[PDB]
Amino acid sequence: MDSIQAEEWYFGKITRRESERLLLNAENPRGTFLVRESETTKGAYCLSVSDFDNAKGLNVKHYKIRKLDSGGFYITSRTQFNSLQQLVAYYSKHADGLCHRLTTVCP
Amino acid sequence: YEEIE
């Protein structure tokens, strides 16, 4: 009954202030992420994540999701997938040199 | 944003 337009990590087109406000939520664990729609880029997507540190608190790392002109995506040239979910799974298993392994999603 | 490196 669900679809790519309503996944556990799909919110739609949100604003920028609300973006850092959803991941910076002090009530969020380190590793939460979300897949919003392109806002300051082409009609692609944007996978943001959350991180913590003993420097000041918790910040947010925005990882723009690339889009292959053929019909796919790849935040990096070494990671291409044919489904926003597939890319969300790889990052949700091996940071592959990322800042953290995707584990939670935006509430 | 952040690059995957």
Cβ pair A104, A31 in contact under 8 A:
yes
| CATH code (residue A28) | 3.30.505.10
CB atoms under 10 Å from CB of A100, counted, come to 16
Contact with chain B for residue A99, Cβ under 8 A: yes
Query: What residue numbers bound the domain in which A96 lies?
Result: 1-107
Q: How many domains does chain A have?
A: 1
Alpha helices by DSSP H, A1-107:
16-23, 84-91
User: Burial letters for A57-96: b for 16+ Cβ neighbours within 10 Å, e otherwise?
Assistant: ebebbbbbbbbeeeeebebbeebebeebeebbebbbeeee
Shortest distance between the Cα of B3 and any Cα of chain A, in A, equals: 7
Elucidated via: NMR
Q: Is A40 on the interface with B (CB under 8 A)?
A: no
Residue type for position A90: Y
Contact between chains at A79 and B4 (C-beta distance less than 8 A): yes
DSSP state of A66: P
In contact, A99 and A51? CB cutoff 8 Å: yes
